């Protein structure tokens, strides 16, 4: 959502799925996330070496109220506005739940049907996952996992 | 008539009208929910017309059309002589004329315009909020909602993404739920002049 709330990483010899799994359990990320405690929203950006087409997306929450997935194409450049929505901002916790810490770990699968078609049809080498949690700013909220499925 | 629609409806009559509408609706099926909205819901001493929002658990955004859910209610209010005329007969909206009952000797009440909208259950409270108003209130509420990254319309409240793209409709089980999302302290229906 803005550079200081965005953790950018290179996914060199790994696809988006592997890059994410490694990012999320990475000490550097956990320390970065710690440094951003108290923040209403954070994102991670996966810089893919090879552009990929994303069939569907599985998301495992870790205390986020909303999650959104956007995609971008680095060639030519890519500012914030040039990102295209892949998975529209989606609910994982209510404000009540956010405050009570109840059901922080919902999993939702989003098949081709639930993604933005125009975007899911294209290929991308930037994947931005945005986690919003305005109701529990102080928790180290994010995702347990995010998986991208490709042909 | 003609001159009738331009008359104001005292809150007292609106209250009598509400009873007839809610009683008949509850009698048809207690799972129905009906709410008289508009300035009446905001506590106004008088109204220009009666606006009823109807929902039923069986009718949702995802379900098939269910016009019978509305027609059944409209026909019953005709049967009890409350709705005296039909202007528009829609699948999801009825627009017509109604009139309170009077005694054999008592003077007849003026005919009143009445709208009845059938709204999917999952869009109901957004509808109740919208149609309660006021217009100025709604405008203020929408503005604050945007500032907070939400778009509220007649149907839904949706989170706006980082490029401004509205997300999925958020589950709303009450008006209170909507205020909660945008972190506004609840404004009671009768506290919504502005
Ligand atoms: Na580009």
Briefly say what this structure is.
The complex is a heterodimer of chains A (151) and B (194). Chain A has a single domain, classed as Galactose-binding domain-like (Jelly Rolls).
Overview of the structural elements:
Chain B: One of its GO terms (molecular function) is lyase activity. Chain B: Mg(2+) 1 binds at residues 49, 51. Chain B: Belongs to the DNA polymerase type-X family. Chain B: Its EC number is 2.7.7.7, 4.2.99.-, 4.2.99.18. Chain B: Its cofactor is Mg(2+). The complex is a heterodimer of chains A (151) and B (194). Chain A has 151 residues and is an alpha+beta fold. In chain A, 19% of the residues lie in helices and 40% in strands. Chain A contains 4 helices and 8 strands. Chain A has helices spanning 16-24, 27-35, 95-100, 117-120, and strands spanning 6-11, 41-52, 56-62, 66-72, 84-91, 107-110, 124-132, 142-149. The longest helix of chain A has 9 residues, at 16-24. The N and C termini of chain A lie far apart (29 Å). Chain B is α+β, with helices and mostly antiparallel strands. Chain B folds into 2 domains: 8-133, Beta Polymerase, domain 2; 134-192, DNA polymerase, thumb domain (Beta Polymerase, domain 3, 2-Layer Sandwich). Chain B is globular and about 65 Å long. Chain B starts with 8 loop residues before the first strand and ends in a 13-residue tail after the last helix. Chain B has 6 helices and 9 strands. In chain B, strands 2-4-7-6-5 form a 5-stranded mixed sheet, sandwiched between helices. A two-stranded antiparallel sheet of chain B has the order 1-3. The chains are: A alpha+beta (151), B alpha+beta (194). Chain A binds chain B through residues 1, 43, 66, 68, 70, 80-81, 83-85, 88-91, 94-96, 128, 130, 132, 134-135, and chain B through 148-149, 158-163, 165-168, 170-171, 177, 180-181, 183. Bound molecules: sodium ion (NA). Sodium ion (NA) binds at residues 73, 75-78, 82 of chain A.
């Amino acid at each position: 959502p803005e550079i200081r709330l965005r953790h950018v990483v290179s996914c060199s010899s790994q696809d988006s799925t592997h890059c994410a799994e490694n990012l999320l359990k990475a000490d550097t990320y956990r320390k970065w996330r710690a440094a951003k405690a108290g923040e209403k929203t954070i994102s991670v950006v996966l810089q893919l070496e090879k552009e990929e087409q994303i069939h569907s997306v599985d998301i495992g929450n870790d205390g986020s109220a909303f999650v959104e997935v956007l995609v971008g194409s680095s060639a030519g450049g890519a500012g914030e506005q040039d990102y295209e929505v892949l998975l529209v901002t989606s609910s994982f916790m209510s404000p009540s739940e956010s405050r009570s810490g109840s059901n922080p770990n919902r999993v939702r699968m989003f098949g081709p049907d639930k993604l933005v078609r125009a975007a899911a049809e294209k290929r991308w080498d930037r994947v931005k996952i945005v986690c919003s949690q305005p109701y529990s700013k102080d928790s180290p909220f994010g995702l347990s996992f995010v998986r991208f499925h490709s042909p | 008539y003609f001159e009738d629609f331009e008359k104001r409806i005292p809150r007292e009559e609106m209250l009598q009208m509400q009873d007839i509408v809610l009683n008949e609706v509850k009698k048809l099926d207690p799972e129905y929910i009906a709410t008289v909205c508009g300035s009446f819901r905001r506590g106004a001493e008088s109204s220009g017309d009666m606006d009823v929002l109807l929902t039923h658990p069986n009718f949702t955004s995802e379900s098939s059309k269910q016009p019978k859910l509305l027609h059944r209610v409209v026909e019953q209010l005709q049967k009890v002589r409350f709705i005296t005329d039909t202007l528009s007969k829609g699948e999801t909206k009825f627009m017509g004329v109604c009139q309170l009952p009077s005694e054999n000797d008592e003077n007849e009440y003026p005919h009143r315009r009445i709208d009845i909208r059938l709204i999917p259950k999952d869009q109901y409270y957004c509808g109740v909020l919208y149609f309660t108003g006021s217009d100025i209130f709604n405008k203020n509420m929408r503005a604050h909602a945007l500032e907070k990254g939400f778009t509220i319309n007649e149907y839904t409240i949706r989170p706006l993404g980082v490029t401004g793209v509205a997300g999925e409709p958020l589950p709303v089980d009450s008006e209170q739920d909507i205020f909660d999302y945008i972190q506004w302290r609840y404004r009671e229906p009768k506290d919504r002049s502005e």
